[PDB]
């Protein structure tokens, strides 16, 4: 019965089974708009600068 | 997979669940010698709740006989139908107990019951998943009150978790076959009341009414007694045999009908029940299998439910109905006679359909009520049973075996306290 | 896009054994899985030809599921798929949600699990239950609490049959339904509800069929689904997706009870006689003859209307004819709620079934609208429970299971603060 | 290829040995007159095991019949599967021991077991690859016992490699035919423990008790119980004769059930055994061979297995089967049934499947358990040897013939320290 | 290119009887099996079995070898004293057989350590093997008994005793047990009541799924010297889970849609091991993909994608890239009477993880409990043994469970 209880609480505790690729995914897809981000930042100031 | 062991004791047993093995093989196709000869795949389905496959087609009974004098078990042996038991599992002792409960329960009980239990176990793991177990006795005999009862009381702390149906006829002063159906009919069902699971009242009384109004017999012999008790038994255990537009299990019947552990007696009735004469006038529609089910002069106890009340009732059809139909005649029959229904229970009555009929009819039916007039029988019993005790007959039978005087004096107070608490939900 | 759809119960495999009947017969696919792009959302195609449903029978009972294994569509369905226990929980809310419940679910959901990785861009789950019973009620809930864990932001669109007021077949169901409903609150994102009496006095009426059985009701029912999934399945002028549901309708996180309604449930003979157009199902839609729970939203006043058009429908005359209806004073909408309807056409008609008695329409509304009659239904359930529970009937078989007294009064105060919560929204 | 080479002793070997003539014979198809009938191919490969060819498809069996009284030997060669032994092979004595160990064993054996040996030898080297000798005796006998036993020696002083198996029966008190039982079965197994390579315990309660209680015969002539005992000993040497999906000569079983070098005493059963009445309310499965096998009531000892635990136990199955249903029978009583077993030893069974099922069967089975119960008997045997010797019954008998008062101290010695090692294993 | 196959015991031939019917129904390509093999076996039942049967003009009569007398489930018996006198004529004829060959990437060995014959004389022709040939590669597929199903009672003084022999002997060791193979039976082929000749047939499909690569021109080849560096670490860490995919039946294959991303998933999954052990308390070491059939690049390179961003299974700290994949062709063959369905591609899984250290563990306590008593010793030591290598070969084994939890770390 503890054994049990420890199971559901952990299992609540995960927040889903497919939450932890979700949150994976979503941070590697910040980590791409960024990067493209900062590319178009760096060409209008390079194009200012001529 | 849903699974029903079936058990008969003492003679009352024996011919009832004779006659009961030839209605449902006749259902399933089989013949006599025990070898399939049906033609619908339907019958093929749903063999393993009551029967086993040996080899080629032969498919045994899974039933076990119990009695102990060996008259009844020839006759059983004799009849046709009669070769497809298998001979071990007429478990079966020699002396006889003789209409003397304390011999069925103490004395000869105690070197015959290991044996059936035996049969029983081998009967119950040679099967995968338990539906429950069919005792089918009667309440006046020796053999099959004590000694089955006994079996009851070992069966339940064995398997706890599993229902037990026994259809018990219970003795009335009208048919007074022994002399002292009191005393073992009180003891009974004292064990009955804190063992089995479920009851269905039965009389010899009421059956005799049926053969003679609705029936319209002759000569009504044992064999038709039977026949309208084995009727009633494959009606109810329908539902799992065969689909259906709604199917209700033992189990989903158990919780349906009894609102307290102790409230588990009921009164049983068959629809259509029609003589040959008028078998040729009639119709077969909903409302006519209705009002001739809900008929107090169907009833197969002499408990005439009208001078009670109806805690929770429940009808169980066969064949291809419409379920509106259906629904509808239930509501009918508890808006007009709101007053012989309980008042803090609405839609007293479950309700289910089977597509499938028995052989012979298009379309039939099976009522099962938990009414509280079945204590009329309670106190009906008593009385006989105080008036011998209170000046000690017949009791040196009794005392000299084992039994002491507080056996009888609980079994009263127990018997007493039931019919108050039938009175007090009334 | 992808919609899984599960059922659970006796009521629930039947309900979807005239589903997929009704979807194979309108995507033109044999009973066997052959063709002799659109079916995408519910079949997954095997790519040697056979096309699979996405769905899971599951009960706990064997005898309702195996006759599907040898009806027609023994081919249709994978085998994995139609789930069965080895013992009914016999109508008792607790034994399914707890005796045999820990037992069943755990099995359907890894099945559940392949059938969404399977799937793409799922819109979500839509769930067929009845909660008079004790498999659709007490493993349903417990089902809905892991899906609700598992996935959260998906829409569950449940399609539940309540108990109805009158006509009833089994006699512990007041217990079953408020347990059932105390789970079925935070769980299901839109619940739809079905009742059967309504449904019975349809067929009596409308299709003037006076000896229905539980077929009749069942197809009707497919119809309703199959309105409702062609904007899924099919384009239209006027689309909408089942994520629009889950905003346009339901005010409150904890109103999400929906009456369902559709039109022209007609005869073979009326409609050679009669006139279809949009005006006049657009009335008929509205009208409390023609609705699928014995309540009346005249006594209730709505929140917000849906309305599903199928068949040869210009928009301009949806348009004309919801504003009828508001210009009308026999039904009123919440002061809070200017605008009251949710309007949707598509262009494909509904297909008949041989064997049916739907007549061939020329076209069709399916209207899903929010009300407070709803709250009516809920109290009404309430008086009778109550009457009973005070003197503990029927309670000693849901406690022997492994319940308490507990969870009765705590229930029956949850459902009871539901109906204060009606109460003040509809002032 | 393997070859067996058989030797029958005394009454009870002889006529024991001609119903296993009997059956062999008609298992591998070979006539009364000794030519071959069979129809099948797989008769013909392996009868080597059991025969020699020797003119026009002559088989004669590799037999030896050996005795002290002639009515066994004209008996034998009066009936049926009489006239196929050689007439050189019936080496027979004159005068006759008549149930004296000392004459079987010291005074007339000395001028027999030369001429066995003789025969034997010969009939040995006629085949390639010996695998074992099989005797079939008594230890209640003379000539039976106090002879074979004698020929067990010096067999298993000359060839110490090559296996043997002894189908013997032990007397008990409750058949007791002679009353110098204990003088001989207790000086017989002196010899057995320290000679025998594995030794098949038999006796007669078990046997009479089978054919009243399962099988149900009214008159068990000796004809049916020797019927029994041949049907067992088809049954263990059925790997050699046939392919099978797992294949256990005799060297197999031996060490696998052996776990120390003295304890080699097994009690034996086979299965099916059924009624007449009943044979068609059966099924053929696995389990239900399973069921009938471990039952104590079925073992050919009157020694009940639950009264100790199982130290090994094996079972040679025969028919078209599955080896899954084999090994989860095995592991099912291995684990519902775990105090009967020895705790210091997983796996106590070992199983073996032959694809040659018995004619007239489809599947037959075999039961060889390595049990501590066996100890029971003898304590029930030395409490009568002391009871005897205490006071020097029917000593004089023994005495006056060799041996001597230190013989009998030997033999309680030996005796009481095994039952002691029993005690010490369980 | 050829490669011969050499088969042991009562186990060995009968699996060799459902390979070789399967390698003729299969088929220059024959080249490297057409055969090259040798069955042998103390007991002449089952090897006679096959010189009646149907494959009776297929076999050289030669090739067929056979004893005179069985070991009975004894090691000692089937490794000093029988098998002394038949080891030798064995091994002089594979050789002749080697020179037959030119090519020849290896030998390989069917046996069950069980048994006497199996174990015993397996041992005895793998230290001859090993000291003539020594580069050769010598695949053993061996069958271990199971934890809870089981035979014979003496088998884990066999398992031991063989043990000790199959490390230091055998380059790529295989192990395959019969529980796990009647549970992958029960549950994907749903056959409740399974007997030997289905076990030998699946365990014939690997087998074929892992020569495929030589035997037919595929996307993407692999050789018999590719797994012997690809898959084992250290020099006495080889030891194989096994699995497959699709095991299916006929009517279920139809209706499921077979593709490359889910049975990479399915051959992962501890219900689909060859072996009863559970991986989910190992850590993967490297795995070995083998795809037959319809299979291009890119999908089996996203499968193991998705396994490795997986978390329900975990690798060694030690290989990011912890794969090795291989492609071919031809899609597997199917044997009328088989109950695996036509498939177009399938995928047969070999690993290396420290799972297999738990069943060597579970394995040293059945086999101390008896021989603390001295249980059965006195039969193998009256064969010719001693006290003294049941103790070493005790010790061995514990030396490899410090090993395997040395490495898992
Ligand atoms: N609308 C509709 N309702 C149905 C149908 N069949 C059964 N029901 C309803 O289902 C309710 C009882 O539940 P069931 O689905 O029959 O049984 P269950 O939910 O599986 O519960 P158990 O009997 O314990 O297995 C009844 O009150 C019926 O109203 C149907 O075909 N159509
Ligand atoms: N997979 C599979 N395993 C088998 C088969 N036959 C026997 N075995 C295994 O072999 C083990 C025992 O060894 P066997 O092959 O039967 O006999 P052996 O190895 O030749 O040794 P001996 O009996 O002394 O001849 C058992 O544990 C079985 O699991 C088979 O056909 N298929
Ligand atoms: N319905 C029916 N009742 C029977 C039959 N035979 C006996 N009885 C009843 O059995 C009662 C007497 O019980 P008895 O047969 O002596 O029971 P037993 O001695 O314990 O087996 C009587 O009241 C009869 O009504 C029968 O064939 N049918
Ligand atoms: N099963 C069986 N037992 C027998 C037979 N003949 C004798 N016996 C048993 O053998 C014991 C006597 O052995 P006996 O014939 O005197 O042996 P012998 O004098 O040395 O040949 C008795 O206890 C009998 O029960 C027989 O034909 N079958
Ligand atoms: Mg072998």
């Known amino acids: 019965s503890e ?15 497919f939450s932890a690729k979700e949150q994976s995914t979503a941070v590697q897809k910040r980590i791409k708009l960024l990067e493209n981000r900062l590319e178009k930042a760096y060409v209008k100031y390079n194009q200012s600068i001529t | 997979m849903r699974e029903i062991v079936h058990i008969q004791g003492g003679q009352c047993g024996n011919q009832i669940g004779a006659k009961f093995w030839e209605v449902v093989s006749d259902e399933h196709g089989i013949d006599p010698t025990g070898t399939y000869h049906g033609d619908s795949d339907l019958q093929l389905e749903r063999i393993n709740v009551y029967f086993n496959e040996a080899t080629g087609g032969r498919y045994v009974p899974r039933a076990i006989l119990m009695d102990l004098e060996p008259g009844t078990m020839d006759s059983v042996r004799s009849g046709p139908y009669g070769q497809i038991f298998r001979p071990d599992n007429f478990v079966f002792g020699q002396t006889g107990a003789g209409n003397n409960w304390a011999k069925g ?17 081998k009967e119950a793991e040679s099967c995968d998943c ?8 009667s309440l006046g005999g020796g053999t099959g009150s004590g000694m089955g009862t006994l079996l009851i009381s070992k069966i339940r702390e064995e398997y706890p978790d599993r229902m037990m149906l026994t259809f018990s006829v219970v003795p009335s002063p009208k048919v007074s076959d022994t002399v002292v159906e009191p005393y073992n009919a009180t003891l009974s069902v004292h064990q009955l009341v804190e063992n089995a699971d479920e009851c269905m009242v039965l009389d010899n009384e009421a059956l005799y009414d049926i053969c003679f109004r609705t029936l319209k017999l002759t000569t009504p012999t044992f064999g038709d007694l039977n026949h309208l008790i084995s009727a009633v038994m494959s009606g109810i255990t329908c539902c799992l045999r065969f689909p259906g537009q709604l199917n209700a299990d033992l189990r989903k019947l158990a919780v349906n009908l009894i609102p307290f552990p102790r409230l588990h007696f009921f009164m049983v009735g068959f629809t259509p029940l029609t003589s040959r004469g008028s078998q040729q006038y009639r119709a077969l529609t909903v409302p006519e299998l209705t009002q001739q089910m809900w008929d107090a002069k169907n009833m197969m106890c002499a408990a005439d439910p009208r001078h009670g009340r109806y805690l929770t009732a429940s009808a169980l059809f066969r064949g291809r109905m419409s379920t509106k139909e259906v629904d509808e005649q239930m ?57 011998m005790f209170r000046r000690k007959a017949f009791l040196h039978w009794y005392t000299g075996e084992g039994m002491d005087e507080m056996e009888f004096t609980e079994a009263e107070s127990n018997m007493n306290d039931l019919v108050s608490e039938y009175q007090q939900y009334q | 896009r992808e919609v899984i759809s599960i059922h659970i119960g006796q009521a629930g495999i039947q309900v979807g054994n005239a589903c997929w009947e009704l979807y194979c017969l309108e995507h033109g696919i044999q009973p066997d899985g052959q063709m002799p792009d659109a079916f995408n959302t519910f079949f997954s195609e095997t790519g040697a030809g056979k096309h699979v449903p996405r769905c899971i029978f599951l009960d706990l009972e064997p005898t309702v599921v195996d006759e599907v294994r040898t009806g027609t569509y023994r081919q249709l369905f994978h085998p994995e798929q139609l789930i069965s226990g080895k013992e009914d929980a016999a109508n008792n809310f607790a034994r399914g949600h707890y005796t045999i419940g820990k037992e069943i ?49 998906k829409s569950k669109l449940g399609f539940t049959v309540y108990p109805s007021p009158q006509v009833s077949t089994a006699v512990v169901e007041p217990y079953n339904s408020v347990l059932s409903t105390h789970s079925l609150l935070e769980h299901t994102d839109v619940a739809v509800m079905l009742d059967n009496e309504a449904i019975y006095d349809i067929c009596r009426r409308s299709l003037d069929i006076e000896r229905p059985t539980y077929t009749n009701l069942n197809r009707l029912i497919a119809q309703v689904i199959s309105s409702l999934t062609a904007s899924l399945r099919f384009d239209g002028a006027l689309n909408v997706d089942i994520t629009e549901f889950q905003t346009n309708l339901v005010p409150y996180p904890r109103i999400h009870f929906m009456l369902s309604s559709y039109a022209p449930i007609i005869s073979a003979e009326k409609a050679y006689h009669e006139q279809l157009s949009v005006a006049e199902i657009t009335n008929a839609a509205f009208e409390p003859a023609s609705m699928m729970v014995k309540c009346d939203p005249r006594h209730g006043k709505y929140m917000a209307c849906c309305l599903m058009y199928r068949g040869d429908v210009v928009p301009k005359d949806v348009n004309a004819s919801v504003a009828t209806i508001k210009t009308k004073r026999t039904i009123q909408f919440v002061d809070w709620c200017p605008t009251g309807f949710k309007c949707g056409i598509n262009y494909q008609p509904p297909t008949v079934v041989p064997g049916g008695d739907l007549a061939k329409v020329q076209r069709a509304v399916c209207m899903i609208s929010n009300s407070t009659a709803i709250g009516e239904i809920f109290s009404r359930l309430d008086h009778k429970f109550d009457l009973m529970y005070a003197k503990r009937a029927f309670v000693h078989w849901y406690v022997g299971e492994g319940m308490e007294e507990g969870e009765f009064s705590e229930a029956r105060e949850d459902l009871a603060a539901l109906e204060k919560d009606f109460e003040e929204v509809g002032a």
Request: some cysteine; overall charge neutral; proline content about 2%.
């Open chain 3, 105 to 153: 679910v755990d099995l359907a959901l890894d099945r559940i699990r392949k059938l969404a990785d399977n799937c793409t861009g799922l819109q979500g789950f839509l769930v067929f239950n009845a909660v008079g019973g004790g498999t659709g009620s007490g493993l349903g809930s417990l089902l809905l609490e892991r899906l609700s864990v598992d996935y959260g932001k």
């Open chain 2, 130 to 137: 338990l539906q429950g177990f069919q005792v089918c006795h």
């Open chain 2, 331 to 387: 509501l009918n029959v508890q808006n007009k006679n709101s007053s012989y229904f309980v008042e803090w229970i609405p839609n007293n009555v479950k309700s289910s359909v089977c597509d499938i009929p028995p052989k012979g009819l298009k379309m039939s039916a099976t009522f099962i009520g938990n009414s509280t007039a079945i204590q009329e029988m309670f106190k009906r019993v008593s009385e006989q049973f105080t008036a």
């Open chain 2, 105 to 121: 329960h103490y004395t000869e009980g105690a070197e015959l019951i290991d044996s059936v239990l035996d049969v029983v176990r």
């Open chain 1, 3 to 17: 054994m049990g209880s420890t199971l559901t609480t952990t299992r609540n505790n995960m927040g889903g089974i």
